[PDB]
Each structure stands twice: as C-alpha cells, then as structure tokens.
Symmetry: C3
Subunit: 182 residues, 3 copies
C-alpha cells in the first residue's frame, strides 16, 4: 500500500507523502473559498461541498468549516452542521441521514502514537468514525477516532465521546457516559 492507502485504511503512514500533501492543499483552497463566502452565496457553498466531500446530497453547513482532505467525509441525506465545525478526515467519517451538528462539533479520525519517538518520526495514523441515522450532536462535543455512534443518539453539549455509543441513548460528560435511554 501507498502512504495514501495506508492513511485511509487506518495504518501508519507519513503525511509528508507528496500526494497527501497536494490533497491537503486542495482541501484548504476549497475551505478558504467556503469560509469567506458572502452570507447570500448559498449556491456557491453547495457547489463547494459537492467538490470537497466523498459523498453529499442535501447538506447545509454554516461557515466556518474545516477538514483535512474532504474526500474522506461521506454524508447521508438532509445533513446540517452549525457554525465552526471541524472534521479531521484522515480515515473515513461516515454520517447517516438526518444528522444535526450543533456549533463547534469536532470529529477526529487523526491520531498520533503515544510514544514520543514514534510520534516525532513523522509516522501517524487514524481510526474511522461512523455515525448512524437521526443523530443530534450537541454544541462543542468531541467525537474521537475509532468511535461508532448508533441510530437516534443524542450527544449532550460539551460531551467528549471516547467509546462507541449504542442506539437510542443520550450520552454526556467527559468521558461521555449514558445519561438517559430513549
């Protein structure tokens, strides 16, 4: 596997890879255009998301938005994200239908080795994130690498989600825990 294929697969890779580096620049060019767009340039924002993402249909994302690659973000139907969300998509971020992200939600797939030498080596890795259908993620929440969230979940504002979340629950806290069953 190439560095790019390894990255997507959740294997150790080098981000300084030429191809990945070019990909990151392209994403940042699209995001710069998105984030400076005039309030009324709805149509442009829609075109940019279709150019950026791995899959999108209907999506509404309040500026600002940030991501690493774009092409590793796969959205189901009728997606909404409020102001200033971030998706570090080194591995796939798969989001189901009718998702709502509140302001400042961060979703991370990127990680580094815990060992300092390994970390400073230029080697890094990722773990994918999968989110089901009808998920509402409250403001300022953090979704960590390798997490799967089921269907019909509510993530409370400010929650830090470190482990999988099953269907039909509310989770809150840091580390998040189940606080209510639906």
């Amino acid at each position: 596997s190439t560095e790019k294929e390894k990255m997507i697969a959740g294997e150790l890779y080098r981000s300084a890879d030429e191809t990945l580096s070019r990909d990151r620049l392209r994403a940042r060019q699209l995001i710069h255009r998105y984030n400076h767009s005039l309030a009324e340039e709805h149509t442009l924002r829609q075109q940019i998301l279709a150019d950026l993402f791995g899959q999108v249909t209907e999506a509404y994302i309040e500026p600002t938005f940030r991501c690493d690659y774009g092409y590793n973000i796969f959205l189901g139907n009728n997606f909404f994200a409020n102001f200033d969300c971030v998706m570090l998509d080194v591995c796939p971020i798969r989001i189901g239908d009718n998702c709502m992200l509140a302001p400042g939600v961060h979703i991370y797939t990127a990680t580094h080795p815990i060992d300092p030498v390994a970390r400073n080596s230029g080697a890094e890795l990722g773990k994918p994130v999968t989110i089901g259908n009808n998920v509402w993620i409250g403001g300022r929440a953090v979704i960590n690498p390798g997490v799967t969230i089921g269907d019909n979940v509510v993530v409370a504002s400010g929650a830090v989600v470190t482990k999988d979340v099953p269907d039909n629950v509310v989770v809150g806290g840091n580390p998040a825990r189940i606080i209510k069953k639906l």
Copy 2:
C-alpha cells in the same frame, strides 16, 4: 401565536418559517461584516452591535462572533466577550452588567426534541438563558438552554453548565458543580 412568537416564548416552532428565515439571513449579513472588519474598525463594530442586538450600551466583542437572530440578545452595561464566542439566541439571552466572557464561550438557547421523529419533523424549541451582574465565564465554557446564572459568579474554563447557578459561587466541571463559595 406565530412561529416567531412561539420561538421567542420557548414553545415548539418551525425555523423554516418565512419570517424567521429572513431574520436569520439579516443576522448573518451583519455578522459577516463584523467578522471581516479590519482590526482598527472599532467604530463600525460598535454600529453593527447596536443594529444586531436587542439591547446594548457599552460592549466590546473580539471577532469572531456568531449568533442566530441578534435581536434576542440583551446586554447590560460594560459587556466584554473575547475571541470567537457564540450565542444561539432562539429565546432571549439576558446578560447583566459588567459581564466578561473568555474566548470561545458558547451560550445556547436552542434545542431539539430528544425523540428522533419529533426532531426530524422540522419542529424545534428553545429555553431562555439569564445571566446576572458581575459574571465571569471562563474560556471554552458552555451555557445550556434554560439556565439562570446569578450575580458574582465565576464559571471555570471548560465548564459545561447544565443547571442553574446561584449567586456568589465558582462552578467547574462537566456537568458543572460548585467548587468554591465566595
């Protein structure tokens, strides 16, 4: 009641209401101008806040700032907010005199039904937030819908405030709890 009146009152409403939709666009036009203003355009920033907010006198808000409507934000005298605060003002956000928000404070009045069908219906609601006099809210804190904060409160950085806070206390944690009496 109209959808707008219901929204402000904390009843279920539809954000796709024509009037609310126009109101949101207007707020975003003002916020776009605010957030791109040159470092030295103090005077313009002052004019924009007087056009945006339900009430303001003396206020200093570091860009960026974000909100939903503007007109549901009511500030007492001598207000300060540091970089990149967010106020989702579907219901009134009432803030007393001499308040200080640190960077990245989020105040939410907006909420959704916990039930997925209800949530996907287009119906949503809010609960007002009221903050007293001489309140200091530390960086990255989250103030949730329906919370009242009393006078002379300190909210520690990163606190997630889920319940009312009485006068003359320090609160911290997620969910926040009292950590010191003044």
Copy 3:
C-alpha cells in the same frame, strides 16, 4: 514596575495601560493578516509568525490563530498547531521542541480576580504556562494559567488541565487527571 512589566511578571496590572493597549492592536493587525491569508501564502504566514512571537524557528500554524500580545509566546523547534488555536499570552507561554497542538487548543495565562469588585476595578493578572518537549495536546483541550506540563506528555482531546502535569503521562477529563503512565 510599569503596568507592562507587572503583567509579564504575573502581578496585578491594568490592561487599559496605554502601552499594553497599543501592543494589543499591533498583535491584532498581524493576526488579521494571518487569518485572511490565502491557502498558498505559506511564506507570508511564516514572516508574520516571526514578527509576532517572542521566539520561533520552525513553526506551522493552521489558520485561524488568535493571541493577545504575541511577544509573550516562545516556541521551541518544529512546532505545529492545527486549526483555530488560541493563546492568551499576558504572561509567558513557553513551549518546548516538537510540540503538536490539535484543533482548537486554548492556552490561557490571563485571569481575573474571583472577587467581583476587584474584577470590575480594571485590575487583572496572569500566571505563566510552560510546556516541555515532545508534548501532544489533543483537540479542544484547555491549558489553564500557571500550569507546567512536563516532557513526553499526551493531553487527551477535550481535557481541561487545571494543575501541573508531570513527565511521561497521559491526562484526560475535566478536571484532567492521569489516565495512563508511559
């Protein structure tokens, strides 16, 4: 001591001091240029960081970035910060070599008196932050005033660090606590 010298030393000072006020405007002018720079204006961004910081060699900082003064930020070699980090540098922020900040990391040295009258007086203060070598700070973490972080530390995403962190540990939670020894 002057208000400026007091500020840097972690003594009570008045931010409305003429010199400090001019310094803040200069920092904001540089940050405005940084944050609007085109995706490809790498060279400009490098020049701006060398003009802004108290010390920098090799540094890569994704826009946006925010700070108070600039000159109180001292970076060791091979520094990286991801999107939208904030450093309130009223006192020195000293960061060692090979540091990595994830998106939205906030580092605060600024603080206010807990007493409301003291706080509203215009008097404020700070406490320095020192971070060692080979530190990785996860996304959305908060580093509070007066904290020292040792070498080879991992700060988990969303951690709120309120006390010193010794060498060779992982810390997480709010308030952060040790969750693993390396």
